[PDB]
Each structure stands twice: as C-alpha cells, then as structure tokens.
UniProtKB/TrEMBL annotation, chain A:
Residue intervals passing through the bilayer: none
Pathways involved: Lipid metabolism; sphingolipid metabolism; Sphingolipid metabolism
Tree of life domain: Bacteria
Name recorded for this polypeptide: Putative sphingosine-1-phosphate lyase
Organism in which the protein naturally occurs: Symbiobacterium thermophilum (strain DSM 24528 / JCM 14929 / IAM 14863 / T)
Protein family (similarity comment): Belongs to the group II decarboxylase family. Sphingosine-1-phosphate lyase subfamily.
GO molecular function: aromatic-L-amino-acid decarboxylase activity; identical protein binding; pyridoxal phosphate binding; sphinganine-1-phosphate aldolase activity
Cell compartments where the protein resides: Endoplasmic reticulum membrane
Sites of N6-(pyridoxal phosphate)lysine modification: 234
Principal cellular location given in the protein's record: endoplasmic reticulum
GO cellular component: membrane
Cofactor field: pyridoxal 5'-phosphate
Keyword tags: Endoplasmic reticulum, Lipid metabolism, Lyase, Membrane, Pyridoxal phosphate, Sphingolipid metabolism, Transmembrane, Transmembrane helix
Positions spanned in the full protein: 64 to 472 of 507
Membrane topology label: Single-pass membrane protein
Length: 395, 441
C-alpha cells in the first residue's frame, strides 16, 4: 500500500480509504455479533466527549453506572456505600492515577515528601512509570516458591515514607493471585494505602469464586484494600480504551481530581489524566456490561476457566514443560530442561502469538473466550507437543 | 442528570443480561435528545466537524479497526496509521525546516501532548543540565493542562502577564526565566481568548537561553497553516523557527479526526527519547511505551489517518476558509453591538466581554435562547469557538440576532439564572462536589 509521508493535495475517495483499511484487516482480543453490537453503540455515541457533560449527560451516566456496577462486583457494599471511583482509559491510567493519588494523599495527610511504594517484583511495569512520572521510590519485593508476593519481604520493606503497597489479582507475568488479604492487612496495620491491581482479574475472579474455583478475597471485602483497578475492555468485554479505578472512600478519590480556579479559560476540572476524551468508548463498556449481566460473565468465565483446566492438564502432561505457580486462566510455561524461547519460536512458526517472559524465561498464554472455541486448546496442545519434540532434538 | 426518571438507573450488574436491542435503544434515545445542540451549531467547540456523512465515514473506519498498538505485531496496520499521521502533521508544521529530524507520537489528546512535553523537558533537563528543581514559564493564558503537568511531575510553573491585546508579554517572560527554567511555551492560539502569542520572539528567548520552547497548537494546529496560506495574518508559530523545540496539535479538534486523538512533535529525536518509557527486567518481558497509555485504542488512530487523507490540503483549506469567513462575519456583527467588546484580535475563537454590562447575564440570556458557549473569567466574558457547524447557513446570523436581543434585555435589567454561579478554594470544594454529582447514581 502507498505510504503517506505528507498530506495529499486532493483528498482521497472515502471508498478507497476504507478499502485499504479493510484490506489490512483481512490476550490482545478478549465474537462477530458482540463486536458488531459494540460497534453500533460506538456509532451512536461517536460525537460524545465527557469533558462537556452539559452536552453529553448520556455519557456522564454511562460512566457513573459502569463505576457503580463494577464497585458492587468488587465488594463495594462491604465498604458501606463509600466506595467511589472513575472511568479511566486503561489499566495503566488506573494504576498511574492511584499512585499519583496515594502520593498526593500522603503529602497532605502524613507530610510525606519522599514517597515510597512497595510492590511485588511481579507487579505490572506501569508501576515503574508512575514511579518515574510522579517521583515515587518504587521498591519491588521478591516472590515466593509459587510465585506469589512474599509478604514478609514486603513487611521488611515498608518505611515511614511508604505511602502504599500493592498486590496483583492476578499479576500479568505468571497469572497468579497475590496474598491480597495479608497484604491489605500489612497495609492497614501501618496506615498506608493498599492498592489491588485487578486489571486482568477484575471481571473473571468474582465469578470464578462463585464458580467453585479457589480465589482469595482480593477486593473491598477487605478493610485494608483502599483502592482497586479493573479493566472493562479486556475481560469486561467492553471495547478497547476503557477501565475503572475505585477507592474505598471519597476522601481518597478527591486527591485524584485536578482543579484549576483562576485560569482565564474558566473554571477547569478533570477527574482523570485526559481532558477531552471519547465518551463513545464509555458507552461501549456500559453496553457490554448490561448486555452480559451476571449470567453473561458467569458463563464466559466458566468457559474460559474450563479451557484453562484442559490446557494446564495437557501442558503438565509433558515432563519437560513446567507451569509457573498455580494460575487459573493466564498461564506461564517454562522448561528447566529445554530452551523455552525455542519452544515458543517453533510454536510461533505454527501460528501462535504468545508473550515471551523473562526472569525467569518462559512464554505465557492469556486464555480468552477465543480459546474456548472448539479444538482450539486441542490444537494448542498438539502444536506444543510437536514443538517440544523438535527442540529436544535440536538444542 | 435529566434521564434520572426517563431511563432505569443501574447501580449494580443485572443478573440476566439485557437485550442488545433494548440497550441500543436507550443509547439512541439519549442521542436523540442530545444531537441537535451540537449538530445545529449551538455549541462552542465540542463538535468540530459534525457532518452526517463524514461522521458516518469515520464510524465505519472505527468499525474496521475495532485493535491496539501495544501489540504492533498483531496490528502493524495501526503502527502505520500513527506513523503516517505524525509524518503528515509534522510536514504541515514546518517539519522540513528542521531538516528531517522532526519526530513525534500520537497521544490521546491535547492534554497528553502537553503533559508528555512537560515531562520530557523535565527529564531532558535533568539528564542534560542537571536541573532538579525544574521550572516552566508560560503565559497566564496558557492552557490549564500546564498546571496539571506541574503538579504531576513536580515542575514549578510560572505564569507571566499578558499585554494590552491579550498576547503573552515576552519581556515579563524573559524576566521570569531562571537557571532552573527548562522550557517556555506559547499558545497558537490560546483557548481563553483565541489569540496567537508572539511565538517568534518566545522561541528566540528560548534558544538564547538554551531551554525548551513548546508551542501549544492544539487548537490552531490544523487551521493556522491554511489561514496563513489564505491571506490572514498569522506569525510563524511552528518548526520554521529554530527555537521551537516541540509543538502539539489536536487531530481530533480541527484535524476533524474522531475524538480521543492528538499529536506531540519534537524538533529532534534526542528529545523524543526522553518521553519514551522502558522497563528491562520486569518478569513480564521487555516493556516499552511511547506515551502515558499502555494499551491504546488503535481504532481512534485510524480515524485520524482516515480523516486527514480524506480531506487533504484542499479539504483543510476549504474548511478553514469557511470557518474564518464565518468568524469575520461574526466578529463584525459583535463589534457593531454596543456595548460589547472582543478581547484581543482573534481569528476564529472569539472572546466577547462588556465593560458596560454583566456579560455573564448576556451569556445566560443567550443560553436561554439555546446556545452552549463557554464562560471565561479574569476577565469576565464568554467565548465562541467557531466550528464547521457555524459555517452553516443563517447560523452566524441567528447568533448575532439572538445576541442583539440578549444585550437589549440586560441593558434594561441589571439579572439571574446560571449567571450568579460563574460570578478560590470554595471553587475546589464546589467543583469536586460537582464531579461527584456527575458520578452519582
Ligand atoms: Cl472541546
């Protein structure tokens, strides 16, 4: 296709443009008719922009309802109605905002000016961003034998300047859920924040729980948990570019808000990083949640977890492959025997786009509704078994 | 919160899962109440194109790229869109003058652009100048997002005074720069009054001190180059100036791309790199992100690429012609009305105030007649961000008419409504409760 290094003089046929885009189109994605549906939602809300709520009160509603429903899904009632929050643009914005908030909260509240934060080494890399961005010393603690945060190590690391601790539910690298309860307990005992990163697990964990699978309380059921983030786009099945950050009580949330009084451009407030932003995306989340409902999520996470079971089984049924920790649907597989990167590469050749991890070396499969399709997991295992045979005879 | 009673509120997930039809119906229903406002040119800014078929077009684009760039290996299509959008924008802003070194990134809005630049200048200056108490010098008119960056990234923000015609006072700026100043900025134009700052002397001030010069062209980015080409008076404001080290332009505003998309440009790669974030020894693998966001809606980038290609230089020319011509007509009518006054000499974004009357009341009367325009303060005035939507027939004529009636009113009644409100910490105490009411269920 023609490359454009500079604006066309003329202006091209909309048809021609649409053709090229379609031509190219001919984890990552978390169904034909569902997508079709969200796309039509978007279309209806295309012009939306939550910065001007006076013009789009429709969006201001969507956002509020999405936050509400999510909070309730994460034990918001346990907090006794004080739980609040905001729709962000992704897990990262959620993570950044929280970190920023805890910083601001702690300066105002504790006089802390050299903020420090304690997260498991497994904690999402976005934590390091926040750290550099907002000038917070980030202290990453070690994991334990089953790749969960070592809480003792965490306890040792907290300091009079620590403003918050975090745990992942689950973490991206290995897909295990951290000891959220003892972490949130550590938190409370020191009077510092506890943030749960449930960006990945936010919309599957509550139903896995309800479903008989082993998951520790990880949300607002715990007094210590002061904030938790969950991604409505990934497993919430909302359209990409949308997420949620929740706080136990309003006093925290307010530290996240930005307000400017004497700007000649008028009064200025923004709840998030963004100023103007795509209300349309919020619509897709609201729509996706309502279309699914508790039943919808239950069924989806059932299918996913069941596939994961099947898959984990097949995998473990190769003595040369090892699963890191005991993940539920996000799986990290490594080899003490072989060059896992090669196994991953062979697999890549056979058409799989899976994520390579390191420290330790392993690739990971973020199981998705897309894998609950028939023979999919069966295909995976088959290709995997052939890939290992290869590497065995070609180190 | 008008639909409180019109539509069921959801405080918690439905047990069942609702008909997609029913859902779509409610959303469309709200859209039916809402479209006219912006579609019928009653809105200051908000919607910048608003044309039925153009929107329809971008919507179909979105649908096709329905796709994020954090996984470029899966969506190299997007990685292209973003690169081409940056390229075309840079060229439109004098990128060639910089001699091919101009680079940049697609962000999610003018704000992200502004934040990123500020962050970059901070990081650049620490690494390069050892500056650890960064300070930044912007005109008081400079967008409020500058204050955000300041609090976010721990940069002392110094706002300098404007001159009689509401342009940055460069002398004041010169006086304010310090061994710790990492960057100065100017707006092309600013949001409050829509005037373009003395970018040339500012960018000169910058170079002479070896500090950054950022031009905020979020608003003017996609109209100024064509207004220039069109015979209207606009100073060089982009990379044509050696001193300008970075400039931001919003493809979603007057670029006519779909909402949620923008561009930040740097004169040379060495600056851009300070914006990038990279994490090596995360067990989750190698991690890089060019912007604030990790995962970002590639679909939106597509809509910008598509919007730019569909328009082309001809497209922008025509559009800005129409807009500027309306603005002329409008400014004329306004200046003819005693006793109002236009602040500075804006081209399409207009700030009108009254030394004679309570402008907020004039704004409120106007509001009653159906106009959604932005109330400014310090000084008091409302502003009209002219848009393709106002280039429609009798629109400006409607505006002037309603305006003239609104002034007659206030003349004989010096006065309530939403006016009382618009009239320092109580503000934060209040605006916060407001943000809470918004999110209330
Ligand atoms: Cl706007």
């Amino acid at each position: 296709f023609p490359s454009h290094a500079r604006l066309p003089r003329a202006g091209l046929p909309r048809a021609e443009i649409l053709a090229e885009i379609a031509a190219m189109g001919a984890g990552a994605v978390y169904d034909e008719h569902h997508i079709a549906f969200l796309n039509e939602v978007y279309a209806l809300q295309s012009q939306s922009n939550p910065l001007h709520p006076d013009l789009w009160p429709s969006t201001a509603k969507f956002e509020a309802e999405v936050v509400a429903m999510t909070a309730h899904m994460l034990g918001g009632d346990a907090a006794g109605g004080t739980v609040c929050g905001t729709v962000t643009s992704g897990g990262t914005e959620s993570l950044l905002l929280a970190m920023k908030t805890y910083r601001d909260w702690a300066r105002a509240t504790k006089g802390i000016t050299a903020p420090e934060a304690v997260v498991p080494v497994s904690a999402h890399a976005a934590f390091d961003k926040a750290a550099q961005y907002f000038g917070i010393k980030l202290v990453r603690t070690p994991l334990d034998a089953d790749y969960r945060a070592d809480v003792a190590a965490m306890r040792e690391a907290i300091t009079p300047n620590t403003v918050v601790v975090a745990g992942s539910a689950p973490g991206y690298p290995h897909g295990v859920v951290d000891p959220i309860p003892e972490i949130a307990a550590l938190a409370a005992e020191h009077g510092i924040g506890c943030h749960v990163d449930a960006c990945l697990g936010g919309f599957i964990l509550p139903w896995a729980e309800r479903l008989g699978y082993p998951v520790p309380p990880f949300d607002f059921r715990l007094e210590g948990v002061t904030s938790v983030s969950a991604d409505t786009h990934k497993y919430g099945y909302g359209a990409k570019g949308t997420s949620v950050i929740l706080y136990r009580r309003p006093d925290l949330l307010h530290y996240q808000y930005f307000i400017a009084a004497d700007w000649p451009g008028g009064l200025y407030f923004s709840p998030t990083f963004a100023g103007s932003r795509p209300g349309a995306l919020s619509a897709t989340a609201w729509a996706a949640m309502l279309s699914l409902g508790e039943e919808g999520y239950l069924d989806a996470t059932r299918r996913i977890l069941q596939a994961a079971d099947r898959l984990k089984a097949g995998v473990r049924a190769i003595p040369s492959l090892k699963i890191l920790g005991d993940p539920l649907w996000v799986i990290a597989v490594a080899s003490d025997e072989l060059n896992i990167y090669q196994v991953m590469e062979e697999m890549a050749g056979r058409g799989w786009r899976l994520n390579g991890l390191h420290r330790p070396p392993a690739f990971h499969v973020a199981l998705t509704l897309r894998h609950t399709e028939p023979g999919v997991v069966d295909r995976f295992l088959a290709d995997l078994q052939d890939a290992v045979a290869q590497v065995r005879a070609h180190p």
